Amino acid sequence: MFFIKDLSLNITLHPSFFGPRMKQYLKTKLLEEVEGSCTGKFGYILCVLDYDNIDIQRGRILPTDGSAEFNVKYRAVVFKPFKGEVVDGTVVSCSQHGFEVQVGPMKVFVTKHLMPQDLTFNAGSNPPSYQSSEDVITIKSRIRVKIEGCISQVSSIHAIGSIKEDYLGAI
Amino acid sequence: RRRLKKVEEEENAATLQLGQEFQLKQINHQGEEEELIALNLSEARLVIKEALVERRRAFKRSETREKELESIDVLLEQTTGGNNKDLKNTMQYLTNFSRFRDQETVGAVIQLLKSTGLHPFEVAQLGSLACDTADEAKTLIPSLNNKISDDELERILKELSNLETL
Amino acid sequence: TXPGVTXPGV
Amino acid sequence: TXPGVTXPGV
Amino acid sequence: RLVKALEDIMVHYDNTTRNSLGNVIQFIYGEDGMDAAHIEKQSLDTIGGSDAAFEKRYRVDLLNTDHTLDPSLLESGSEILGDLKLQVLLDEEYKQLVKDRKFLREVFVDGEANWPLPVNIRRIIQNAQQTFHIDHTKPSDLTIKDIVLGVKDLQENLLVLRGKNEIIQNAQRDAVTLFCCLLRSRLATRRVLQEYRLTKQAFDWVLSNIEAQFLRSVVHPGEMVGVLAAQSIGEPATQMKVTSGVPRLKEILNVAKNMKTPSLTVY
Amino acid sequence: IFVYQNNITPSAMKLVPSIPPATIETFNEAALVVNITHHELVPKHIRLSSDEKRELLKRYRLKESQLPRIQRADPVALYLGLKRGEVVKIIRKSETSGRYASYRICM
Amino acid sequence: LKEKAIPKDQRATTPYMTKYERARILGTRALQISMNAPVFVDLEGETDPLRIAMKELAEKKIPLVIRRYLPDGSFEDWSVEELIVDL
Amino acid sequence: LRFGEMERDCMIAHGAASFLKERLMEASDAFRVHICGICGLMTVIAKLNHNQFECKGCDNKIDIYQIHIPYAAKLLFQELMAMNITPRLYTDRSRDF
Amino acid sequence: VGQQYSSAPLRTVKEVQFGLFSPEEVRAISVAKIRFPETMDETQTRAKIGGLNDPRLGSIDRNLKCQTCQEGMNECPGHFGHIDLAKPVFHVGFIAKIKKVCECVCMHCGKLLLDEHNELMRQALAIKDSKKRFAAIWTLCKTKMVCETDVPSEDDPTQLVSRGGCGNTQPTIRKDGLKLVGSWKKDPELRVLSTEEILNIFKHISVKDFTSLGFNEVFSRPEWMILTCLPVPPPPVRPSGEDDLTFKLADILKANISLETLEHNGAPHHAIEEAESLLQFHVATYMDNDIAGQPQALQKSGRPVKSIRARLKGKEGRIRGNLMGKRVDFSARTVISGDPNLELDQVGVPKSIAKTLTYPEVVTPYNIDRLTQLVRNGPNEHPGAKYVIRDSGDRIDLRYSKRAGDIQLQYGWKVERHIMDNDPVLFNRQPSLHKMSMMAHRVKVIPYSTFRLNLSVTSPYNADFDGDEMNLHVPQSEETRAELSQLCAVPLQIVSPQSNKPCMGIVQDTLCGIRKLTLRDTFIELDQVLNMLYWVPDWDGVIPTPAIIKPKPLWSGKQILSVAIPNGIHLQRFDEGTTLLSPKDNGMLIIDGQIIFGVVEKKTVGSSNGGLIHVVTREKGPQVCAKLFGNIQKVVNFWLLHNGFSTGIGDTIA
Amino acid sequence: AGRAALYKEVYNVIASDGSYVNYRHMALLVDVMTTQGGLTSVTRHGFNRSNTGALMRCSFEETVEILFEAGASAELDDCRGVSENVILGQMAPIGTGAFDVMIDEESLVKYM
DNA sequence: TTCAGCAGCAGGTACTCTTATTCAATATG
RNA sequence: CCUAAGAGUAC
DNA sequence: CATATTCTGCTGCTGAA
Ligand SMILES: [Mg+2]
Ligand SMILES: [Zn+2]
Ligand SMILES: [Zn+2]
Ligand SMILES: [Zn+2]
């Protein structure tokens, strides 16, 4: 889910970069390094709050190196998927094993085992869809899904969902 | 301490075991402690919009779904540059699944949930998911079970649904 | 003790 | 001690 | 062995001397907080001599004639006689000198006058005399109130510890008391007006240089005094009835239960 | 303070520690013939109060164990009746500065 | 770390720069000058980084602060500008 | 030439910490080794070309640090490890001074 | 090439946490299991898989990468293996500690003998430091020989409070070599306490019990003192002719295999115990070959085996011989000769030594030109450059590079070039008993094979020129160079903290001459006066008015020597019997830099407190004091050269 | 009084041959030897048994036994001593290392 | 109110050079 | 290449 | 016939009269 959390990053600056725009270089290097990133400790990091005055502190010169080590402290918005949490999403793909639903920046793979027996896959339809007697779940279709399993991949977090519970599925 | 290797309970939102660093209270950058405020989808959307517009103003000095998508794309390209596929997807997701519109309604919702005196994660989950009835909301969010009375939850969800706009 | 540090005793 | 300057002891 | 034992001793930024564990070895370095290289042997003029010589050297009486000062010594030499507030100032200065004499006799039992102290007051006086061309004939421009208050303010300005609490202030007063005694012994009203004959600017220059030299002589935090002490003890030992020299140093550093010549002194 | 002639039987030493807060200190007459505190090698020892100990640890940023130690068998410590955890201020006539103030904690 | 940092109004350390502080300041500044850092003082033709740093320190144009560590872990931040270089 | 113990002690007395560090590391043996913050041991497999860091046992891949220690120090720590002693190297303080 | 870039964050070690390996931690960190004592396979050309030189532990050849980390020998730190021991053996260095722990804990139920119900146990357990706690607990619980299932009540010794004791009798434990023998009090039965039962009783010790014994729940539990999995160090630890540790590990594996086969095939307890004792002996001698009493495990060649303990300890061990003191680069050593024409802070460096020792100068816009010239000069002429460090890590050698063409220097590169004049260099005479024996000088390149230093600076170094050798170290960075010049410089060391007096002074010929020059009889004519005045480098250019004008202009030696003395120096020393007039010309009076009276000798220009050196360095500064050294040496040496001094047999004849 | 007597003995040793050493060096030595409440010798049994860090304790004597005891007791080495940083090849907190140099953004902008 | 039974061997700081060798002897593929 | 021994060099 | 193996420097009692 979405939170805002206090994060600190250590940035090393070469001696050549200590011009009057040191603050701007530090702030720009904070961006493009943590903005839109993924980690197992804090989930996704989407954006930084309170950019007007980011706490850069002083910055310590590494001895025998000359590079300065800054501990920049900031507020960051985080989207950490959690086990057994219900969130809305948009279905983007369907397959035999399950269907991939777009939740925020991540894709949740809901397996076919975690749906009521009335909902059945149909690859004959173009695009293939998880179709039921009462409704059809196609591309760009809303669905509320309870995430129950998350595997921590630094490159891109992966999650497994379910809609077996009551009032879980297409809205 | 410094325990080599780690033994801990598996994360579970229903059990409210969000994580060792997602506890109820967190130390702010000022040195004091603040309750871990959890953002619902609308509140998080407003926070993201405020942060992005403030960044755009700083860089300058130094509604329908389609037009909102175009506006967020333009503002995203103006504020930040590349490696924003995740942020673009999150922003379009937020513009899609937004429960509240502007500052007034989100402020009313946040103060009303604050009056409930419930867990920040639970109130954020209440604001995030647009339910219909009381027991349906309880079964949607297992962390809501046996935390507040049925009548009080029903009435507060009635006010939430009244505050639900567009 | 020990020896060293018999026994005690012996 | 040591040796030098076993142990003590041993 | 000595260097390994003393390797972690260091003077920290609160002037305390601590080891790697933070344990205090000395609350101030050398019990005076001064660098050793800035210390020179100087004579404490109050501890030695006779009482009559001490009074002749220091006592000034503005109301009587036995221990008065020549009015030709200073510009206001004929108007200060009969003054009362200045007499109070002289009385307290001489009382402080007497207290310093008693304290120094309490510290150094043998009455040794030549002891190592940081700032060489004699050389500063000589430099002022050579720089301002004291003619030894013109009456001094200084007023006695100026001399006494300048000495007191200079003592207030000799800061070894910068803390602003009673403990640090008391430690600071303890750390400068011997040098303050030396300063009062040298910069006395009778001595300044008679032996040295300072002018106003010469006296102020002397005060400023004393303050600057004292602040320059303070030990620098980060000084590795343990290794310095170990080497300063070991090197003379390499240069080297009762056992002495290397065997005795070994018996002292290795705390030996039995030694060759256990002697006892009875007075 | 108990003053004895030659020795205390070990069967009597064991009951010397009474019910608190009563502390029994035993001194031998032979050791009390000469006052150790009048030796010129023995500097001035003053027991610090709890408030003074707190202030000393606050101003110098010291822990309990970072102070110099004085044993709870030292003749001066027995003389002044030091108990463990109490700090004695040591006034010493130093030859570099006229007065030096150290502090020793009882162990 | 807020408790670690002593407020500027009650720093109890000397306002003078130690010989070790001066040596490390000169070394750091010379190593930065050698690595193409901007020079804040106008050069009179000197090419040695050490004497460039000496000239910077003489007229107080070194933008560094000394973090002096107390034995308990607390520190004081003394700007090179306000440190008096008497030696 | 041997930079012996008491030459190092002379340099300590001089207060030239950076020159001593340069003598003992840059001039003689400067070894970069990878450790993890879970266990301070040097059992970190670091495929630098592939940009992969992994300490088996701790099952961690994102909590790796690099330190510059003499190769004699690394050999000492490895010999201690062979002698059933763990020299865990931690890059943060767990106790106040 | 050094080490290539690593994305892992760079930190410094803040805390070192010691402890013991758990067997499961060894199994988790080990990249391979060692099962074959042979280090090479039957082909004798490859490292055997599962052997002691398993490629998963590291590559034994430069041509091959490590099979685990896929890195060269330069990068690979070596990854540990593990040998699964058939039966547990005692870690030798912990045996005594084990003997203590098993004597503090009941050998049947695994609980500490004296709980808190004992009055002395509140005192013992309240101790803060773990070592003192364990000492007290041992010295109080070692004499208890019963588990005490029931103890007198703390409130009063009338009723009995029952703890979780078992009531068995603890044995008296001795060590017979590498094994522990327990004698149970007769209801004495002597039997060997098997390592298996000791490990079982150690694994049953409660967390509170062993944390009261000084152990830690996470880092060192007592049962980890018993070896069940031996960590095998990588070939970097035991490089190759196999190393001693390789042979010891081979013997350990041989013993383990023998014990395993004897246990599996079934054998009398005698053979099993013999194999177990052999394994214990091999493990112990692998960790420590200097066990008291036991015979040393001899290497194949009949010499003692060098154990890990032997490698760590001693003068030539790891700590003292490789970490506290190590052999360093950029250092030179040669014979020292005196030079009266060098400054106090100047050291003469042979041209060959200057050509071998090099300094890395960072390419900067301010020094792009001169460095380029040095690169053009090459390494075979002085001044020149030996290497060019590119920003990519490659290193261009000036030898074998003239064929490739001229090198264009870029900012950020390094020019590793011959040390030139005025380079700060550390200079030492060993043993180097004090800090003044290791001081920073300025290089002066000279065309001879000896270090040349001022005569005055030999006194702190305790150096003669009868064959003494001295060492020279060159800083390789700007920070080290700067702190060497600003902290360890020779002028700054003139006054030592050792005795708050100068350590350098006028010595040897310059002293004798300065006594002969400052005599009242010494009169110098115009020509020699002009030469001596010119020999003073900082002479202001005014000829002093002669002491005697008519009938012949004559200057005295004091007048000429006063030129070297800086202006503004006042010195007044009264020797024995001297008055304001000096009939004997003893004492010393100098007013405003002019020697008023007194023969200058060891008390004035020597390493004495209150002398000229001390006054000058405390009034005008260390640089002025060193310049005074130079000026006095030059003038006095010139005068003594043109006056002469000798000694002979007639000087010893009365 | 033991510290004063120890200083007097050391001073007599130093001045027996006429040499002079400043008071502070011998004062530091005798303060180190008497800071534990008793006379601590400069020997394996004296300064090397105080809990001042296993790495700097082992550098003097009895190295391997000190390492074994540290492993058994799970000692924490705070790396405050000179020997710890020498062994680890990092700048010891001595002399120039007793502080940290840091860059000020506001001061650097203030210069230009 | 008061005393006899032991036992284990390295040893300052740097540096130069030379010389020997690192099992022999016997059984078996 | 390692180990051991010996001879010395300056303190 | 070639290779595997046989000189200085410290410590802890309690039992029986
Ligand atoms: Mg010689
Ligand atoms: Zn790990
Ligand atoms: Zn490898
Ligand atoms: Zn039991």
PDB file of C-alpha atoms in Angstrom, chain I residues 416-518:
ATOM      1  CA  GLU I 416      54.607   9.093 -11.065  1.00  0.00           C
ATOM      2  CA  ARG I 417      57.831  11.081 -11.317  1.00  0.00           C
ATOM      3  CA  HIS I 418      61.272  11.224  -9.729  1.00  0.00           C
ATOM      4  CA  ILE I 419      61.386  13.082  -6.423  1.00  0.00           C
ATOM      5  CA  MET I 420      62.794  16.568  -6.965  1.00  0.00           C
ATOM      6  CA  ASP I 421      64.240  19.327  -4.796  1.00  0.00           C
ATOM      7  CA  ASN I 422      62.171  20.556  -1.825  1.00  0.00           C
ATOM      8  CA  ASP I 423      60.099  17.358  -1.693  1.00  0.00           C
ATOM      9  CA  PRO I 424      59.077  16.516   1.901  1.00  0.00           C
ATOM     10  CA  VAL I 425      60.452  13.087   2.811  1.00  0.00           C
ATOM     11  CA  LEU I 426      60.449  11.231   6.118  1.00  0.00           C
ATOM     12  CA  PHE I 427      63.976  10.373   7.238  1.00  0.00           C
ATOM     13  CA  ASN I 428      64.885   7.874   9.935  1.00  0.00           C
ATOM     14  CA  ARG I 429      67.727   6.187  11.778  1.00  0.00           C
ATOM     15  CA  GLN I 430      66.823   2.970  13.394  1.00  0.00           C
ATOM     16  CA  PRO I 431      66.151   1.744  16.148  1.00  0.00           C
ATOM     17  CA  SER I 432      64.448   5.220  16.141  1.00  0.00           C
ATOM     18  CA  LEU I 433      63.863   5.399  19.883  1.00  0.00           C
ATOM     19  CA  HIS I 434      61.967   8.717  19.737  1.00  0.00           C
ATOM     20  CA  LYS I 435      60.003  10.926  17.362  1.00  0.00           C
ATOM     21  CA  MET I 436      63.009  13.191  16.746  1.00  0.00           C
ATOM     22  CA  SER I 437      64.706  10.144  15.191  1.00  0.00           C
ATOM     23  CA  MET I 438      62.069  10.230  12.429  1.00  0.00           C
ATOM     24  CA  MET I 439      61.741  13.703  10.924  1.00  0.00           C
ATOM     25  CA  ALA I 440      60.651  15.374   7.696  1.00  0.00           C
ATOM     26  CA  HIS I 441      63.421  16.780   5.488  1.00  0.00           C
ATOM     27  CA  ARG I 442      63.540  18.464   2.082  1.00  0.00           C
ATOM     28  CA  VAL I 443      65.167  16.603  -0.800  1.00  0.00           C
ATOM     29  CA  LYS I 444      68.379  17.963  -2.306  1.00  0.00           C
ATOM     30  CA  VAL I 445      69.533  15.765  -5.180  1.00  0.00           C
ATOM     31  CA  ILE I 446      73.281  15.126  -5.015  1.00  0.00           C
ATOM     32  CA  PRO I 447      75.643  13.135  -7.304  1.00  0.00           C
ATOM     33  CA  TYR I 448      77.005  10.646  -4.764  1.00  0.00           C
ATOM     34  CA  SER I 449      75.888   7.367  -3.209  1.00  0.00           C
ATOM     35  CA  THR I 450      75.299   8.614   0.376  1.00  0.00           C
ATOM     36  CA  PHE I 451      72.577  10.442   2.258  1.00  0.00           C
ATOM     37  CA  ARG I 452      73.852  13.875   3.267  1.00  0.00           C
ATOM     38  CA  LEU I 453      72.439  15.627   6.322  1.00  0.00           C
ATOM     39  CA  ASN I 454      73.347  18.604   8.474  1.00  0.00           C
ATOM     40  CA  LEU I 455      75.711  18.006  11.375  1.00  0.00           C
ATOM     41  CA  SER I 456      73.286  19.604  13.839  1.00  0.00           C
ATOM     42  CA  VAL I 457      70.468  17.167  12.992  1.00  0.00           C
ATOM     43  CA  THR I 458      72.650  14.119  13.720  1.00  0.00           C
ATOM     44  CA  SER I 459      72.222  14.608  17.476  1.00  0.00           C
ATOM     45  CA  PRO I 460      68.463  13.785  17.555  1.00  0.00           C
ATOM     46  CA  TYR I 461      69.087  10.918  15.123  1.00  0.00           C
ATOM     47  CA  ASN I 462      72.002   9.628  17.255  1.00  0.00           C
ATOM     48  CA  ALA I 463      73.885   9.251  13.983  1.00  0.00           C
ATOM     49  CA  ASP I 464      77.592   9.073  13.175  1.00  0.00           C
ATOM     50  CA  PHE I 465      79.330   8.627   9.822  1.00  0.00           C
ATOM     51  CA  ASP I 466      81.342   5.485  10.620  1.00  0.00           C
ATOM     52  CA  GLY I 467      79.060   3.245   8.557  1.00  0.00           C
ATOM     53  CA  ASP I 468      75.605   4.235   9.811  1.00  0.00           C
ATOM     54  CA  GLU I 469      72.718   3.526   7.456  1.00  0.00           C
ATOM     55  CA  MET I 470      69.552   5.597   7.375  1.00  0.00           C
ATOM     56  CA  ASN I 471      66.123   5.167   5.804  1.00  0.00           C
ATOM     57  CA  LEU I 472      64.050   7.462   3.598  1.00  0.00           C
ATOM     58  CA  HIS I 473      60.282   7.277   3.030  1.00  0.00           C
ATOM     59  CA  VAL I 474      58.427   9.272   0.369  1.00  0.00           C
ATOM     60  CA  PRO I 475      54.747  10.236   0.792  1.00  0.00           C
ATOM     61  CA  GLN I 476      52.515   9.255  -2.124  1.00  0.00           C
ATOM     62  CA  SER I 477      49.656  11.737  -1.651  1.00  0.00           C
ATOM     63  CA  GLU I 478      49.111  15.433  -1.043  1.00  0.00           C
ATOM     64  CA  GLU I 479      47.591  14.939   2.423  1.00  0.00           C
ATOM     65  CA  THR I 480      50.531  12.878   3.679  1.00  0.00           C
ATOM     66  CA  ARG I 481      53.002  15.296   2.075  1.00  0.00           C
ATOM     67  CA  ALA I 482      51.274  18.295   3.662  1.00  0.00           C
ATOM     68  CA  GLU I 483      51.063  16.816   7.152  1.00  0.00           C
ATOM     69  CA  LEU I 484      54.673  15.661   6.828  1.00  0.00           C
ATOM     70  CA  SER I 485      55.713  19.237   6.055  1.00  0.00           C
ATOM     71  CA  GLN I 486      53.464  20.842   8.700  1.00  0.00           C
ATOM     72  CA  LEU I 487      53.880  18.368  11.589  1.00  0.00           C
ATOM     73  CA  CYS I 488      57.096  16.335  11.264  1.00  0.00           C
ATOM     74  CA  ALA I 489      59.335  19.040   9.779  1.00  0.00           C
ATOM     75  CA  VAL I 490      62.859  19.326  11.172  1.00  0.00           C
ATOM     76  CA  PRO I 491      62.520  23.019  12.196  1.00  0.00           C
ATOM     77  CA  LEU I 492      59.358  22.165  14.145  1.00  0.00           C
ATOM     78  CA  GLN I 493      61.275  19.455  16.046  1.00  0.00           C
ATOM     79  CA  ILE I 494      64.082  21.788  17.167  1.00  0.00           C
ATOM     80  CA  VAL I 495      62.600  22.086  20.664  1.00  0.00           C
ATOM     81  CA  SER I 496      61.627  18.704  21.957  1.00  0.00           C
ATOM     82  CA  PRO I 497      58.817  17.914  24.408  1.00  0.00           C
ATOM     83  CA  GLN I 498      61.217  15.398  25.979  1.00  0.00           C
ATOM     84  CA  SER I 499      63.029  18.015  28.078  1.00  0.00           C
ATOM     85  CA  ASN I 500      61.416  21.304  26.924  1.00  0.00           C
ATOM     86  CA  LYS I 501      64.821  22.210  25.472  1.00  0.00           C
ATOM     87  CA  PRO I 502      66.343  22.074  21.981  1.00  0.00           C
ATOM     88  CA  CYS I 503      67.467  18.660  20.757  1.00  0.00           C
ATOM     89  CA  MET I 504      69.674  20.091  17.985  1.00  0.00           C
ATOM     90  CA  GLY I 505      72.635  22.396  18.423  1.00  0.00           C
ATOM     91  CA  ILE I 506      76.067  23.386  17.198  1.00  0.00           C
ATOM     92  CA  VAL I 507      78.307  20.323  17.459  1.00  0.00           C
ATOM     93  CA  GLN I 508      81.753  19.015  16.497  1.00  0.00           C
ATOM     94  CA  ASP I 509      83.935  21.321  14.350  1.00  0.00           C
ATOM     95  CA  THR I 510      81.428  24.179  14.225  1.00  0.00           C
ATOM     96  CA  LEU I 511      81.414  24.175  18.024  1.00  0.00           C
ATOM     97  CA  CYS I 512      85.208  24.253  18.333  1.00  0.00           C
ATOM     98  CA  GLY I 513      85.494  26.964  15.703  1.00  0.00           C
ATOM     99  CA  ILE I 514      82.772  29.013  17.349  1.00  0.00           C
ATOM    100  CA  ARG I 515      84.835  28.952  20.537  1.00  0.00           C
ATOM    101  CA  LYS I 516      87.989  29.948  18.656  1.00  0.00           C
ATOM    102  CA  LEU I 517      86.253  32.605  16.553  1.00  0.00           C
ATOM    103  CA  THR I 518      84.623  34.367  19.523  1.00  0.00           C
TER     104      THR I 518
END
